[PDB]
Amino acid sequence: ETVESCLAKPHTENSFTNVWKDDKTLDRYANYEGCLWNATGVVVCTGDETQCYGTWVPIGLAIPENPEYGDTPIPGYTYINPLDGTYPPGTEQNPANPNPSLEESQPLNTFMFQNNRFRNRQGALTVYTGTVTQGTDPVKTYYQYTPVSSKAMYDAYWNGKFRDCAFHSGFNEDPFVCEYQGQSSDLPQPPVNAAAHHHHH
Amino acid sequence: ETVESCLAKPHTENSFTNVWKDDKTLDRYANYEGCLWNATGVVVCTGDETQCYGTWVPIGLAIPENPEYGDTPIPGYTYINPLDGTYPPGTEQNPANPNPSLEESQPLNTFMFQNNRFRNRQGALTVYTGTVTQGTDPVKTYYQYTPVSSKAMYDAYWNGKFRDCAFHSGFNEDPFVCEYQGQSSDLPQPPVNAAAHHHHH
């Protein structure tokens, strides 16, 4: 395939396996038919983030990276994109500070929701967006927390769905795994990307 | 509309006006029919980025913003998304450092391409994605430069499209505006959301 041929493929609504997520933007990707695809909004994924069902758009050539599989629908959850811009910070609607913050070490008060790490500071939600560096000799490494811009994430919070995990002190360890992991929804099988050749070269 | 009715709308391939971009993810958004839409894939936008043509996906309720249009096509450029993940850093194909760095002040020899500010270090391209803050008062501000993950951007760079703007050295505080602003292309008019659609939540 070429970049042009990939971009010409039709968008496809189906389950893809071997899904990966960009640690900074939280975007989900997968390889299929020699092309790289990006999931667009409304996503249903398994508990782990191995498979996701939704509207996939071809964005370029497949990139190197990457049990069994049946024909029966499997359990999953409707996944929320924490940074989708539906409730942007620094606005009248969402007055939270729009600037990301830095932590020298992973904070003690974080909670895990749909495989993302979050912090709650009196109703202001932030999400872990990977590490960043500052300076040279020595290079300082920081854990970056970015203000959440997802209305659906805040709706869940305001509906009291994170009572067991968003108000917790922390310490000795890492994140509190929330009991709520989203609305249940099944993924059709098998993934269209099942075949091993979609994941090679 | 409701969040669910907005999500049930079909993806639309059309030109939208009153477009805005997320400074951190570089996402493009617009309001239409009481819903918020996000452009997916490569879009065609005007020079100022007021209008973009492409595949738009409904992601939630419309959000507050803050004569006119004809019916003949207008000139625009094929816009690339610098953080689209088609050529991720920290890999065999793209050996750039995968970590964003924080600058105490804007770096020197930067250039403007499609209203984004970039830095070029011996072929390693980095893009300005906004301010990050730290330190319980005073409150120190940093300028974040994130590794470019767009293969298209690198292709243009490698083909010598940025000859005049990306290869400066020395002391240059203001960014050089690149002559190349992308491949010319036309946008159908008028925009689908031209009418005062942009009012009342």
* Sign, CA torsion A53/A84/B103/B86: positive
* Residues of A whose CB is below 8 A from B86: 36, 59-61, 63
Give the integer Cα–Cα distance in Å for A119 and A82.
12
C-beta separation of B179 from B166 below 8 A: no
| Reported structure resolution in angstroms | 1.9
Q: Which residues contact A105 (CB under 8 A, 6 or more apart)?
A: A143
Q: What angle do CA B96, B99, B104 make, to 5 degrees?
A: 110
Give the integer Cα–Cα distance in Å for A117 and A128.
5
Give the integer Cα–Cα distance in Å for A61 and A2.
7
Question: Token digits for A188?
Answer: 């059709």
Method: X-ray
Q: What angle do CA A100, A106, A112 make, to 5 degrees?
A: 85
If 0-12 CB within 10 Å is exposed, 13-18 middle and 19+ buried, where does residue A201 land?
exposed
* Residues of B whose CB is below 8 A from A25: 25, 83, 85
Residue of A26, A24, A18, A12 whose CA lies nearest to A153:
A26
Q: Which residues contact A182 (CB under 8 A, 6 or more apart)?
A: A77, A78, A79, A80, A113, A114
* Sign, CA torsion A76/A29/B2/B4: negative
With tokens 């930067």, the residue in question is B110
Q: Shortest CB distance from B102 goes to which of A22, A63, A134?
A: A134
Across A168-189, b (16+ Cβ under 10 Å) vs e yields beeeeeebbebebebeeeebeb
C-beta separation of B165 from B112 below 8 A: yes
Question: Token digits for B113?
Answer: 């391409």
Question: Token digits for B64?
Answer: 């507050």
Q: How many CA atoms lie within 13 A of B36 on its CB side?
A: 23
C-beta separation of A79 from A52 below 8 A: yes
Helix (H, G, I), strand (E, B) or coil at A5: helix
Domains in chain A, CATH or no CATH each? 1-78+183-192 (2.30.27.10), 79-182 (3.90.450.1)
Q: Which residues contact A67 (CB under 8 A, 6 or more apart)?
A: none
- The 10 Å Cβ neighbour count of residue A8 is 11
Restricting to A residues 48-107, those with a Cβ less than 8 Å away from any Cβ of B are 55, 57-61, 63-64, 83-88, 91-93, 97, 99-102
Give the integer Cα–Cα distance in Å for B42 and A126.
29
Q: Find, in chain B, the residue whose alpha carbon is nearest to that of A150.
A: B60
Helix (H) or strand (E) holding B192: none
Q: Which residues contact B65 (CB under 8 A, 6 or more apart)?
A: B18, B20, B31, B198
Longest dimension (CA), chain A: 55
Question: Token digits for B91?
Answer: 């890999």
Q: What angle do CA A88, A89, A94 make, to 5 degrees?
A: 90
If 0-12 CB within 10 Å is exposed, 13-18 middle and 19+ buried, where does residue B162 land?
buried
Q: Shortest CB distance from A133 goes to which of B3, B101, B152?
A: B101
Give the integer Cα–Cα distance in Å for B2 and B8.
10
Q: How many CA atoms lie within 13 A of B154 on its CB side?
A: 22
Beta bridge partners of A28: A21
Contact A63 B93 (CB under 8 A): yes
With tokens 């250039």, the residue in question is B111
Q: Which residues contact B74 (CB under 8 A, 6 or more apart)?
A: B46, B51, B186, B187, B189
